[PDB]
């Protein structure tokens, strides 16, 4: 494993695609906000639905999230405030309304 790495993050938002580099040790949401991007959030701690998105391409680490159950992780759900990229990723944002619980 490299000590450090950078990953291309593409966010498909309701109003456009936005893209940015994200370090291996920076959450999706923080890397987006570093580039002026407006995403939904609240707790910023991985324990709610505000920042939910759907993984479309690549792989994510979500050790730091606690709200999504294993079934939801297997459905492609992502808490963008608690997810690190481990590859180039594409994520559809603003998806909280699709969650059941
Ligand atoms: S804002 Fe609450 S889990 Fe991300």
Author numbering: -3 to 97
Please share text taken word for word from the publication where this structure appeared.
The noncanonical amino acid, para‐cyanophenylalanine (CNF), when incorporated into metalloproteins, functions as an infrared spectroscopic probe for the redox state of iron‐sulfur clusters, offering a strategy for determining electron occupancy in the electron transport chains of complex metalloenzymes. In conclusion, we have incorporated the noncanonical amino acid, CNF, into two FeS proteins, and in each case observed a small, reproducible shift (<2 cm−1) in the nitrile stretching band of CNF following cluster reduction and re‐oxidation, which is consistent with an electric field effect from proximity to the cluster(s) in different redox states.
The Y37CNF FdI also exhibited a UV–visible spectrum and reduction potential indistinguishable from the WT protein. The IR spectra of Y37CNF FdI in the as‐isolated state in solution show a low‐intensity but clear nitrile stretching band at 2236.2 cm−1 (top) close to that of free CNF measured in the same buffer solution (2237 cm−1). Superposition of the structures confirms that the cluster environment is well‐preserved in the CNF‐modified protein, and is unaltered by redox state. Site‐specific replacement of tyrosine with CNF causes a small change in conformation of the side chain relative to the native enzyme. This shift is sufficient to alter the crystal packing, placing the CNF side chain in a slightly different environment within the lattice relative to the native Tyr, however, comparison of the structures of oxidized and reduced Y37CNF FdI demonstrates that the redox state of Fe does not influence the geometry of the side chain relative to the [2Fe–2S] cluster position.
